[PDB]
C-alpha cells in the first residue's frame, strides 16, 4: 500500500465511519461513504488517487451525529442503498443516486452505535444501541422483528455486533466488558423473520409483534477488561478488541467444542491469539476486513495503519504490515476495504480521509 491522496471534510468534526459499498456494479467506479457531524457523504475513486466528491445527505437537526453507516440493495430493483444512524436513534435509508431519505425508523429513539446488514437478506438490519439493546429490522416489510435485551442482556451501550457467516448467529460487545451470543437460526426467529415477510398493515388488523429476546445463548467478561468496541466473526472463531492495544482471536468453550454445541452456560473460552500494537488505548476505535477475510486493519490514535495479512494456517501466525505518513497524525477512528481489497480509506478524527492503493 501507498498514500495516494488524502482531504478533509468542511465540518472539521470526527469521522466516526467509513464504507466502501461492495454492492457497486460492474463498470462503475468504487465508491465509499463517510459518516461524521450531522452528514453523510459519498466519493468516487479514480485514476491519480483522485478522490471525486459527489453529494451529502445533511439531517435537518443541526444536532444529529451520524455514527455509522452500512449499505445493502433493493431485494426488487437490485439498486444500491445506505442505511445511516446516530445520536438521535433514528435510522435513515438513503437512497445513494439523489442522497433523498427514502424512509427511517425509530425504536425508542436511543443513541445508535452501529448498523449492519444480514450476509445473506439484504433486508435484514441489524441496529445496537445506547440504551442496550440490539435490534432486527425488516426493511422490505418496515418491522421490528426482535429486540435483544433483558437483564441477561448487555447491562450498558451495546458498542458493535456481527453476524456470522450465513447470518445465522450475532456476537455482540460493549460498555460492560461483555460479548454475547445471540442465535437467530432458532424456530422461534426463523418463525419471526418468514412472519416479517407475511406482514402487510393494509390487509390486517393486527400490529406486528416484535420477539423479545432476553437470554443470549453465550456469554463473557473473560475476553478483556475494559469497553470491548468492535467485534467480526472469523469463521467460528471472534476477533474482538478494546482499548488496551490489542485484538484477541478467541472462541467460546474449549479448543475443540464446535460453536453450534456450545450451551448458554458455558463458563470457558479459548484464546487462539492477539494481535498487539500501539497507541490505540483511548475508546471507540474500530477494525475493519476485507471481502474475503484476508486482511484485517486498524487505524490508531495518532495517525498510524497496522494491516494483519490472515492468510496463514492459524491465527496467532498472523503478519502485520504498517503504513504510515508524515501528515497523517490524528487519530484514525474506521477503515474500509475496497472489495477487491486495491483501495483502503482511513478516516480521522480532523475530518481527514486518507486513501492508500495497492
Ligand atoms: C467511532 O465510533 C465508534 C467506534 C467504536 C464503537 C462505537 C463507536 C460509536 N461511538 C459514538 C459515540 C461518540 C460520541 N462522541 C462525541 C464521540 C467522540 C469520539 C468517539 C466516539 C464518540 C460513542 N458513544 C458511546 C459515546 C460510541
Redesign the pocket.
Known amino acids: 500500500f501507498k498514500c495516494v491522496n488524502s482531504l478533509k471534510e468542511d465540518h472539521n468534526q470526527?469521522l466516526?465511519?467509513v464504507q466502501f459499498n461492495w454492492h457497486s456494479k460492474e463498470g462503475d467506479p468504487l465508491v465509499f461513504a463517510t459518516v461524521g457531524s450531522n452528514r453523510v457523504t459519498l466519493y468516487e475513486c479514480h485514476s491519480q488517487g483522485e478522490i471525486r466528491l459527489l453529494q451529502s445527505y445533511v439531517d435537518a437537526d443541526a444536532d444529529e451525529?451520524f455514527?455509522?453507516c452500512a449499505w445493502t440493495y433493493d431485494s426488487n430493483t437490485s439498486h444500491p442503498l445506505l442505511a445511516v444512524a446516530?445520536?438521535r436513534g433514528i435510522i435513515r435509508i438513503i437512497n445513494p443516486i439523489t442522497m433523498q431519505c427514502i424512509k427511517h425508523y425509530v425504536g425508542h429513539g436511543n443513541?445508535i452505535?452501529?448498523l449492519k446488514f444480514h450476509p445473506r437478506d439484504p433486508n435484514l438490519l441489524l441496529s445496537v444501541s445506547?440504551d442496550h439493546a440490539l435490534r432486527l429490522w425488516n426493511i422490505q416489510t418496515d418491522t421490528l422483528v426482535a429486540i435483544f435485551g433483558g437483564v441477561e442482556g448487555h447491562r450498558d451501550?451495546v458498542?458493535?455486533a456481527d453476524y456470522d457467516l450465513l447470518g445465522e448467529k450475532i456476537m455482540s460487545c460493549?460498555?460492560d466488558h461483555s460479548l454475547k451470543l445471540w442465535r437467530i437460526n432458532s424456530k422461534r426467529m426463523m418463525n419471526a423473520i418468514k412472519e416479517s415477510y407475511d406482514y402487510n398493515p393494509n390487509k390486517t388488523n393486527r400490529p406486528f409483534i416484535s420477539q423479545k429476546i432476553h437470554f443470549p445463548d453465550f456469554s463473557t467478561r473473560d475476553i478483556h477488561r475494559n469497553?470491548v468496541?468492535?467485534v467480526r466473526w472469523l469463521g467460528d472463531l471472534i476477533l474482538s478488541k478494546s482499548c488496551e492495544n490489542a485484538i484477541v482471536c478467541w472462541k467460546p468453550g474449549k479448543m475443540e467444542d464446535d460453536i453450534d454445541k456450545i450451551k448458554p452456560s458455558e463458563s470457558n473460552v479459548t484464546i487462539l491469539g492477539r494481535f498487539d500494537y500501539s497507541q490505540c488505548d483511548?475508546?471507540?476505535?474500530?477494525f475493519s476486513m476485507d471481502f474475503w477475510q484476508k486482511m484485517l486493519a486498524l487505524g490508531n490514535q495518532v495517525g498510524k495503519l497496522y494491516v494483519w495479512d490472515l492468510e496463514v494456517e492459524d491465527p496467532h501466525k498472523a503478519k502485520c504490515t504498517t503504513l504510515t505518513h508524515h501528515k497523517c497524525g490524528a487519530?484514525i477512528?474506521?477503515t474500509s476495504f475496497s472489495r477487491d481489497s486495491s483501495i483502503l480509506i482511513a478516516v480521522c478524527?480532523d475530518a481527514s480521509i486518507w486513501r492508500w492503493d495497492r
Open positions: 470526527p466516526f465511519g451525529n455514527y455509522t446516530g445520536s443513541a452505535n452501529e445506547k451501550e458498542l458493535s460493549g460498555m469497553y468496541d468492535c483511548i475508546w471507540y476505535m474500530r487519530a477512528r474506521q478524527d
